[PDB]
Chain A
Amino acid sequence: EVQLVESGGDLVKPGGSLKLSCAASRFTFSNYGMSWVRQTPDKRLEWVATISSGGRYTYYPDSVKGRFTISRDNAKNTLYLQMSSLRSEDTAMYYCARDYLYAMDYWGQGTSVTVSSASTKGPSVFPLAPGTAALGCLVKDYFPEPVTVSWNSGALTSGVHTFPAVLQSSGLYSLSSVVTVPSSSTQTYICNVNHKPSNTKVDKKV
């Protein structure tokens, strides 16, 4: 039941530095090569770095060679990616993956990195007020991505639709999360919005 958990993503200014970490579990980390792969906003995949099981060898594409440095701590079962001289084109979701035989079999759920001169901005959350009724929350004017949305602290999952963010003319992101419920429902509906980069967490009753 192999597990990989990435952390460290954030908004970084151009020219800046950032270190990602990946915690490995439920396998003998020391016996496998490890890799980083990124997925850019257009959904394309780009291999970023690989390190051999014992750390003897590292490998990079030209796009990051010199600027990115992969390392591992076999005692602590952790993989690292040190990023420096960051460019706007490095904006991406970064995944840690285990090299198993000839390919990368298991990948973490990823950590988000945005490289921009723009400052962080937390979202303004507004209600979408309501036999089937629809209600929701408009999460607008935040930067950078991501925003996570749950309902009733994770208890309401059926009929929930959280839309991909769209970039507005202002350079700020916006998304809505909707839910269909019986029109008969007394019932309290609360959208839980978390924006890790700006340290914004708000709960909005609809």
Chain B
Amino acid sequence: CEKDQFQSRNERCI
């Protein structure tokens, strides 16, 4: 599960 501040916007990889 790839994490970064832009991926976080999809509210899944949190």
Q: Which residue of B lies closest to A47 (CB)?
A: B5
Number of interface residues of B (CB under 8 A): 10
A23-47 interface with B by 8 A CB criterion: 31-35
Q: Cβ of A52 and Cβ of B4 under 8 Å apart?
A: yes
Does B12 have its Cβ within 8 Å of any Cβ on chain A?
no
Q: Cβ of A53 and Cβ of B8 under 8 Å apart?
A: no
Q: Cβ of B5 and Cβ of A53 under 8 Å apart?
A: no
A77-102 interface with B by 8 A CB criterion: 99, 101-102
Q: Cβ of B2 and Cβ of A54 under 8 Å apart?
A: yes
CB distance from A50 to the nearest CB of B (A): 5
Give Cα A99–Cα B2 distance, bound, in whole angstroms.
12
> Could you say which of B1, B4, B14 contacts A99, with CB atoms under 8 Å apart?
B4
Could you say which residues of chain B place their CB within 8 Å of the CB of A53?
1-4
Q: Cβ of B5 and Cβ of A57 under 8 Å apart?
A: no
Q: Cβ of A50 and Cβ of B3 under 8 Å apart?
A: no
CB distance from A138 to the nearest CB of B (A): 44
Q: Cβ of A102 and Cβ of B8 under 8 Å apart?
A: yes
Does A155 have its Cβ within 8 Å of any Cβ on chain B?
no
**How many A residues are at the interface, by size bracket?**
10 to 19
Most A CB contacts (10 A, CB to CB) among B1, B3, B8 go to: B3
Q: Cβ of A99 and Cβ of B3 under 8 Å apart?
A: yes
> Could you say which of B1, B2, B5 contacts A102, with CB atoms under 8 Å apart?
B5
Does A103 have its Cβ within 8 Å of any Cβ on chain B?
yes
Q: Cβ of A51 and Cβ of B8 under 8 Å apart?
A: no
CB distance from A31 to the nearest CB of B (A): 7
Could you say which residues of chain B place their CB within 8 Å of the CB of A135?
none
Does A190 have its Cβ within 8 Å of any Cβ on chain B?
no
CB distance from A62 to the nearest CB of B (A): 16
Could you say which residues of chain B place their CB within 8 Å of the CB of A102?
5, 8-9
Q: A54-B2, A101-B14 are in contact. List 10 more A-B contacts (CB 8 A).
A: A35-B5, A50-B4, A50-B5, A50-B6, A51-B4, A52-B4, A52-B7, A53-B1, A53-B3, A99-B4
Name 7 interchain pairs, CB-CB below 8 A, sorted by A.
A31-B3, A32-B3, A50-B6, A53-B1, A53-B4, A57-B4, A102-B8
